[PDB]
Amino acid sequence: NNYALSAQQLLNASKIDDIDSMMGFERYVPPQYNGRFDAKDIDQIPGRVGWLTNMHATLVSQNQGISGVDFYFLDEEGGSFKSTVVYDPYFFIACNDESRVNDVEELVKKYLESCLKSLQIIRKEDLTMDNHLLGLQKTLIKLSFVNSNQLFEARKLLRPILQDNANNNVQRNIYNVVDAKHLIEDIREYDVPYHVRVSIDKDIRVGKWYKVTQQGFIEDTRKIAFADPVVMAFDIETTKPPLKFPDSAVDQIMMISYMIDGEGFLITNREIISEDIEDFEYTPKPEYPGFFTIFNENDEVALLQRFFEHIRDVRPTVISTFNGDFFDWPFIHNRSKIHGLDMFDEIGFAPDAEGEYKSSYCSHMDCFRWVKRDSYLPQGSQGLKAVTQSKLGYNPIELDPELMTPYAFEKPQHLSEYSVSDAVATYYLYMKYVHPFIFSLCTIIPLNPDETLRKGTGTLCEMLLMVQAYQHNILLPNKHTDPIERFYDGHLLESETYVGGHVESLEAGVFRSDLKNEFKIDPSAIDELLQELPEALKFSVEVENKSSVDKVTNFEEIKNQITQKLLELKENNIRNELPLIYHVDVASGYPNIMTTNRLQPDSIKAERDCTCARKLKWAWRGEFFPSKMDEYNMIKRALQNETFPNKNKKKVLTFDELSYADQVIHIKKRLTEYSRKVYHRVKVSEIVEREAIVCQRENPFYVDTVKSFRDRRYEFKGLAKTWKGNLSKIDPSDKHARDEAKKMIVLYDSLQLAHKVILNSFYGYVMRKGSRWYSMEMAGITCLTGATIIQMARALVERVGRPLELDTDGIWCILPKSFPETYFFTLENGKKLYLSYPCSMLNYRVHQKFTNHQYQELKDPLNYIYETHSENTIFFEVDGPYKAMILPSSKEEGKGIKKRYAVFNEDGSLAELKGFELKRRGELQLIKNFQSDIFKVFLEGDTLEGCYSAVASVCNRWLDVLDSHGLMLEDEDLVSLICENRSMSKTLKEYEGQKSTSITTARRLGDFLGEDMVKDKGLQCKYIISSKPFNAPVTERAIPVAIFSADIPIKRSFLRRWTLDPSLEDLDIRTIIDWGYYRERLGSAIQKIITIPAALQGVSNPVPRVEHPDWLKRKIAT
DNA sequence: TAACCGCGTTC
DNA sequence: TCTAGAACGCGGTTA
């Protein structure tokens, strides 16, 4: 078993060692050395220097295998090697009686003779243990093993003991007034991935330079930049059934385009491609050279052996694809099998336990994983086309997938130009955005490139936190586990959480820098601002700019200018002037709220443990059933008398024989019905204000990890802001200088956004499943604190201006043009400090009301002496003033629309576009193109009324297209304008009992093209709604648009069935469309974006063909 | 009406 | 196995 399972494992190792040697990775062993292990003597110690590019757990011999890690290097002489570190896996046993630890030692040493290599007593800091801040430590038994198989064996042997100790004890003599097994409290750090365990304990990181010596790896801090690995990026294109997805079973690979370190190549399957293709060039932009040599080949099998032999030739340590883990690689694998080729022996690639394709020597960098996790691009923009436009700054070749299989024979040169396009986009997307980010992150996260690319951002956070915990000798907590059911007030809870961010829609309509607005200034607010002005201006200098008032020359001049503008506002409250369209958002809001308040899971105390205590409030919110327990028990007992089908000799089971999970599942389903009948309600929501103790002396390893990564992000966010300033400094006539400045902006804005998701995942991680540091309190406290801060700022903006929209940590607003705006302190050095009074007036009050004055830190660690001080890193950040902001309005009375608007810069360019269907994936294309046309038009017009009039022209043009029953439009534009695409996250089978346009479109796509359409998840349901079944629900009139593309026989059969008209003969799309459905949809968009906002601003309906709601007509009447 | 769900956004 | 969070819009269905 163990030595036997070693066989698969030790055989796979020898195969990997052979594959590695083939690709240039011979296992290097450094010479012997009897001197000292001091890194100052790196040049004298015998060894080989290399750049660490990969690492993998392995099994080595010298009958059982020894656990270890292979480390893959690129040396300085243009070569490569790998070296192995062996390291005994280990986990700990915790005891509930510290005195009797030795007894447990003697038990487990005898009990685990089968697998235990060695045993030892160690101490670690336990953050749940009393007096741990005074130096006390938890005694633990460290169990070490020869390999991970043996570690797992001991886990299997120890779990029964852990279960028997949790259950009740056997009885025996009842008049009798403990054994070694019952002192085993728990096992700890048992589920750490072994290669992570080696990377943490040995402090080794991919992307650093080491010298492999006998005593170990020595980091060469002298070596600065990364070695340059051989990078290959490839894309595959294949034949496909008409209107259907390819099947590796039958379909063949036409061509494989790739690029190796900037040199383009293309291999062709001439049995499908008509002409031999000649070397051509696709350099989409000068920065992206693209000269492609062509390798035309006879059969598909020949194409595969050319791709496999070229890979063997160049020896790539990185292979990049776009969605290659789930399409390209699985195809090349299946086609290699059919042709009697083993891809492993060929190139060393194979699917792993997650079905992804990896190798030992070469990372597989699927750029689609980066786009999905670190781009911050909308899902509508996550395709290679949009990603190339967003990040590489050009348009790549496009080609209808329905024409690719035909164009293989009709125009194969156009097919070849498309494939190389997908290839140039993948190579340069990886080389400019992915490769720098992932390999740099590997320098601080103890994972290899493949894992650093694919692991969730919560897992990345966990990796970073474990390094800090280990290096501070802090015992790792076990992964959090949810109770199988929780209760509130006797009711079974369905779900609980905390109140998140505060969002407000305060005003809708058009706002522009040239159109006047009415402001009612609170004079008592101007008094407060004048009271606060001397200290706020000092706060702007000493805190916001990290200087001193003694070095500024014009502190008084600035103060007098602001005072004057402020007093003029106090004398003239009612004003009707031009607005300043500004946005203020707290930088890294939740993280800075956490680090300011010293928030971390281990700091949340329970009043049974821990001036020292900073009490903070959050809002709990639970959703429970209305049934009380007495009811709850009733259902259960009824279920206990029923029978349940077995999960595949015994055909039935009892309720108590089932899993406690599926039990609750049945209990839930039944309790739902009962309440619906007895209470006429299934869910009851309730909000409870809760308080938690946040100890300010706890070991701040978590808090400090968040501070560090915030500063890590701020570097790139600052560089992004620096280069946005450099771009406005350059003369427009110098194209090359503006281009490079733009390229810097996109690069640093990307790097800061990728760091933004990991940073904010330190907040989400405390609520993540399996979290080693779970705390609902900490998260709720963060959210409530942010909600209190933003409403404080909104209360002030209200009194000196008009807030338009608010979300969590940001406010959009308009201020009077006369409001104190931007100033520049002048320093004795000639330097200038920038001041935005609307920003600094808020930030001063933020620090007045939300500063942590109970923040403590170890001053003297040896004597356990703490010092208390004040901390506040919460700072609003101002952007603007903008040319225009356009906010939509709700169709229903008294309500607004949140999370949707459009903002325009002074130069007319689009600044922000939030929420609207234009950006969302799928949605009705008509609404998308209408929105794409309409928002820029809000800039036209000389008055508010001429503005709405210029927009109305575009509206009525679109309304005309639909009131014309699509006669003005050609056939092509019609199919694309009236199509609504929607993605099914799961598969149709997993949607039982649900009605949706996508579900119906999928069933019909299956009933027509076949079941093969609906086998996978993520199906795109392109449909049009038919008037066919009249007065019938819409989910019933959704026809797949592919129907109008098949042969006429198939169309009539299905259209008649879907229309319930066996007499139908006109199969034109224009005759099937329910143009009334789409006209209402267009009418709904025009109401929310144009007409109803115009009414709110006092403008009679600019599009009278779209009638106001009756509530609005009645409001206008009065 | 109001509750409720799937998707994809803004935070 | 691996797995960051909550608030919200909109087109639907359901009670």
Ligand SMILES: Cc1cn([C@H]2C[C@H](O)[C@@H](COP(=O)(O)OP(=O)(O)OP(=O)(O)O)O2)c(=O)[nH]c1=O
């Ligand atoms: C964008 C985003 C935000 N949030 C939370 C935490 C953020 O502090 C809060 C505010 O969102 P943002 O203001 O978008 O994020 P931020 O304040 O951290 O970054 P920036 O400096 O660019 O303003 O919302 C997440 O939990 N996940 C996310 O993906």
Ligand SMILES: [Ca+2]
């Ligand atoms: Ca492709």
Ligand SMILES: [Ca+2]
């Ligand atoms: Ca921001």
Ligand SMILES: [Ca+2]
């Ligand atoms: Ca923010």
